[model samples]
Target: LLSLPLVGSLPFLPRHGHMHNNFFKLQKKYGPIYSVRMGTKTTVIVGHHQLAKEVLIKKGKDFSGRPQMATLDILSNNRKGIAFADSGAHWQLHRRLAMATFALFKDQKLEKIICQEISTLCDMLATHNGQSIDISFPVFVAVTNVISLICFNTSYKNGDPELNVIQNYNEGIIDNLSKDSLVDLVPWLKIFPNKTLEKLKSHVKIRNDLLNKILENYKEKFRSDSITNMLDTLMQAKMNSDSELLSDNHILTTIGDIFGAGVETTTSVVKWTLAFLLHNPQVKKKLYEEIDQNVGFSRTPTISDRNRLLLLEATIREVLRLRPVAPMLIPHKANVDSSIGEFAVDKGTEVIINLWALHHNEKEWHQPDQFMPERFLNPAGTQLISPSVSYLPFGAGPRSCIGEILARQELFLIMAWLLQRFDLEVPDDGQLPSLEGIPKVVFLIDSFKVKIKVRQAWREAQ
Candidate 1:
């Protein structure tokens, strides 16, 4: 029924359609928290921030576990990736490892690593100087570099052969991980669906082999770097004397999760950012001015630069609001029985929060349908509503994106870092990156493309 409206919601592609068109209509008829069926799942999506706060915060413990995403399990070998796994001690360990490693590195440390990679990436972009280049792929290279530094102590400069492996093979696995996977919901179908098995095997081979290779590389020369990294933190810790330690398979899954989630999400956010800036020349100019004044040509932008770059930060927030790349923040399954006011949520019910819909809901914002970064400009401006209730692009609850802070830094720094040096624009006459992009309805799906270009800055005006 939701697809009925979505089919004509606009020829704008559903993932491209944004969450508002999918859930705002239902919320108008049924209050704040509304449920919609997508595939074999019935997700109870929250519209208003207060309702989101209710489900994700007030009753967060019950909603901590993630739904059984079959693709994730197939690719990850059964809910092993912390991102899509059931919330428990295992999730806690990985989350802690991520935090432990990142926390050790202050904002300055992150910026240093990011800037170092950007320097390399800048040279790569210069390889195509003046010529139009696919913005998504190159931004992806910048993002991949960040993830590599975070996960290990190394990153590939653009044009490395490994880029091809990540671009086509590893990324294809992530694409499968997010799309519809009937096998996950119905475990009984694992063997029944031959296509699912084939995809699972293919995804496993590509990811598992890559993870093992990374681990081997770390063991040989990066053991110290590992201690400085999440993989190191995990390996450095003494096993519990009486512990059911993480198995070899679990370890592989964990590595796969870190690489997959870290790379794709950060990359997606950066791509959308370019699209947003391209559409709003005014916003792009403001960002350019900010970066230029604070960040000179000789010295790159840093974490200390963030406090002064509120507008750029807000632009990122607005983009996440308007088009949360993951249209549906992964579904959450109710652990014990619970209720949203009158609607009784049965135990095991799949709950999804349509971030796209919530951000654009009519009752919530003055112009819910419009893209307004100023909505978040109020640090001094207290509101009747908290930001959490209105925005959950990073999600909420105990199981929100563990990499939220890191991911934001990635977007702001990467975007700001790029704009300071080059100009990104869409062809005035051609379609925008996501204007014609559509969601994949089938298992092995593709078509989420971001069209963009990089240009040289006229002056090093800082």
Candidate 2:
């Protein structure tokens, strides 16, 4: 944790495969709470769950401010959206508006939208014809369509050109975002030549164009009484709010955050869950048995069945704990001079809650690296429970994910529907997908093929 005058610890920091893994390694050498100066900025990394809770929940007000990173500033359009917005009146108002908007879809309406996508995905998987195929793209489309329907009341078919365009631009944005360029660490680097920054800008422009077109269409047909989707809800809110408070740009940026964060994290979690289930067939068997006994094949699994499907819930929790999509919860900045535990953190210090370390902490979890769903279940296995406070997949406190409820519902419905119908196995080529995912802004599972066979019970029922 040595720091130079200007460069800080940039030269001494480990340049490894994943930044989260590097941070996790450094935690062993410097204990749970430590600071590493990136350029002139001092970044305090909290690796312990208790300390994480303290920083996120106890001192949330003081630490809810977002760091001024050039990349995030560009992405959020100078911090207009809730995800990257700095903490203050503007951020608070937008965050509240977003929460209210999301709350509108918490009922059967959202459930139906997700189920429709699930049906589409299942039908696509049914056509596998004994061939080993990668389920990633199909799943991505399904998840994206769900978000699309929620956002703009639009959905895409399998080979839709618009979907392809969105996919390409999104991939580009995600790739460049993960580069952690010097421009992000030091604002002065923006004055120099940076191809990554330019590439990111181009991708952002493409994405903005698409979203702007959608916004314009929605605005042309905007009706407050006939609110149908998230966009409509935001529009309605804008009409009610003061003109200075909520603008069209705010609506656009909020929609972008929802579209990006919603699809990316949920899709990654679903893929990771599927990969884990394939690797651990016994766990899959138990999950199916639990589902069959409680819900049966009379009809598709619904969100209401989540309470009865304890093992399924435990399995999802285990997957989340084992492989959190956002391993380093978005870096938080200190609004005022604060202290996490005994460590004094100066104002504007970047705080990274290393969720990967918290989730994989041996002290909190037994055999932390192993995939054990049973750990999340009670002794009699009748209920789902969290054994430790260290488990935070969606994050915690004020800046926690706004889409947590929707994400969980989407995850459960899609996962339950898929497991209820299809039996996932390793490809015929005998290649099991690697569980160690490619870590980026979100931890992503590499594209791998899976043999999808219709479960006998479901086939018999049909």
Candidate 3:
């Protein structure tokens, strides 16, 4: 349905509902590929897998551009980073820089770093001694520290004030800078008095201040002989390139992109997996059995053990399928005239890939709503398989998630370590965490508390 002028689609859209769910509902009425005018913008939502594949992969170059928004402009320092920057040479340079930096950590070095962080987390959990606890904060800090160490060769202590500042500002940013705000839709709305925009500006200010301090510290300590973290890697690139395009501000924003984008999304997925395991004890039981059988209590599970722990891998995959961190991936833009399947998309059209719909489409999945890890397992349950081309937890093609490898490694190690050492349960007075997550920039699992009892076998071994 074509929206009316000025307030395009505002009248027809649900007043009190999630944007992704609303888009999904519209998909049912308008079919898989349909366009809706969102204020001054035309947004084409792709609900079906094939079309999403077309927009993301098959015709990736044609639809690789990013739609400019007021909020993102402020957040990314006017689109200086990889995630929000428009597709072109600048985007390509930074994307390659990020890819190369990430590649350096794809080996045992990264595994050791993740294991150390998770070890600290498990020790913290042990202090509770079977009491139910809201693990989100500690988990958040632990996950943040992993990115922190990688980004700047630093880690936060349990009560570090700087860590607290980072956490607060990041949360503030997420709370205020929602996916699609009225200010984004109607550019002129930004000129008016808006509390959300005001709050976002303040949060971004605090975040940038902290980031600036970190960048300065790294600059003072820069060493070509020892390339330790991402900051150093970027500095090395800048020093070698000697190009005006790769400026210090570019480095600041790129590091900010990794820090801001990395922490919340990975933390949310880990929390979701924990929530799902609690709700599906049978799956948890199988996971425990596999971990215990493959890599016993004699030692902790490592990345190399991933192939051996098939169920655990499948469970993580299933969690991603059920609740992707970014349900509707960061909106893409059309760089040039392109057609997704049969629909002609003009330049500058904002393309929204409804990953929620793709993952849950009945035609592609059996019991689309259920948490079935076996769907990702082979017939023998010995290996993981791509059960459907429809699944795109990390969207495919040009603009897919850069942190896919890191995220997968982190998720596996965290889950395997936790499952190996402890047994998770719904708290004595609490019910299982809700499966219907509250959607924000990332689909969030509501605050949850679980009993973390040290596993009998592990305790006995210790």
Candidate 4:
């Protein structure tokens, strides 16, 4: 381990703001794999494409264990959710249950639901009529509503009592979860009177109580013969279950994981895409040209049309590459003795994958820092290129995001919907949002000001 005498690796670590960038630089200097002791915890960071693939893909099941975070334990009621749950029977059951239930919605049904929700956003923007506004809030509402409808057969509108509370608590929890917490380093400190811990507890309780009540209401509407949505499907699975691992608490926490992580991740990526498009007008122009020729203005774009929209697909891929929402994927724990590359990882050691380092490596990407979407397309620019081993936005292998399919569908249709009806450009008044982002549970861009105007053809079509 590289470190100082008494403080271990304290001085070597960067502030929360530069964790991702600093870690990349450290990996370059220290080589791909290195161990660092932060206070009482020892963290092993894995990087480079081959090594990442080896650990995350080749040995995925071995590294599926999650490190015990005190706050996570408390927040999840001792690992009730799929995100932080350990690799065991309960985790397996929930994973299988969620995947099977999610398959219940056909692509046509999903596209219709997403377009219906997105139309709500488009209508509101139409009323804005070229006004410069931060599109973040509306995007958050729409993303959350999509998950909410899936998870609970309902949606939260602007003034609903549950809307504000859900947004605030989830935001609070995510902010703290992403950043470095004093208590996380020295978990023993959690035993004392700590304001941060207290606040986290408060936020968790409020959100959990709200979600539990929502789940209860969902259960009251369950029909074995007529499954309505994700929640109902889950209820049906629970009803049919004989295992002790699947219980009421399991159902609530699994849904909570979907709601909390689902909303934040989808919202962040859309925001990044918008900011990038506003800044890169040339890219936007190419995307508009492709969409106009392929999908056209006469109809709203559908999932079936995505294959024809090569530039549009490449632009989203490039956005994810440049601004990966989760640069350092959630830290994984080694359940058994294993070796990554030449280094041996001990049981119970925390394993982290530095995705930022792999994604930005010059060997993996040409002109790694530039905003070039064509890198993701074939030289002919006619087809979507297969992702390189290093390109891991949603991660790869077994522990990758459970919501990957739904997230991709949302990104495509939403971006296509917005571009089909409106053009996003630099505002006349203020500066655009910075490409720079803060690393947390997800990397987030600061809100940018942009003007949106309806396309004349769309108005005429209406």
- lDDT per residue as tens, model 1, 324-399: 6555566678988997755788887887665666777666666755666667777552222235357777777787
Indicate which candidate wins on TM-score.
3
What is the full ranking by lDDT, best candidate first?
3, 2, 4, 1
What are the per-model C-alpha RMSD values against the true structure? 5.8, 3.0, 2.9, 2.9
Model 4 segments more than 4 A misplaced: 1-7, 11-13, 180-194, 241-243
lDDT assessment of candidate 3: 0.83
User: Per-residue lDDT for 230-312 in model 2, tens only?
Assistant: 77777776777556657878778878888898788888888899888888899898888888898899888898998899888
Distance from true location, Cα of 59 in model 1, Å: 1.2
Query: How do the residues 1-462 of candidate 3 rate in per-residue lDDT, one tens digit apiece?
Result: 995665333524444566666767777677988876755579788899989999998999999999887777888888887888999777788878877777666652888889998999999998887799988877788778888888877888877888778879888888876744222333444556768777889999988887888888777888999876788788888888636657877877888888876789888998999998888889999988898899998888888898799888888999999998888888999999889987799999999898989898888898988999999898899788988888898898999988888888888998999999988988999788888887777788888899989989998997
| C-alpha lDDT values of all predictions | 0.65, 0.82, 0.83, 0.79
- Give the best candidate by lDDT: 3
* TM-score of candidate 2 on Cα atoms, chains taken together: 0.93
Give TM-scores for every candidate, taking all chains together and pairing residue i with residue i: 0.82, 0.93, 0.94, 0.93
Residue range with the least summed lDDT across 10 consecutive positions in model 4: 180-189
Cα error of candidate 2 at position 72, Å: 1.5
Candidate 2 runs further than 4 Å off: 1-13, 180-193
Off by over 4 Å in 3: 1-12, 179-193
State the lDDT at 353 in candidate 3: 92
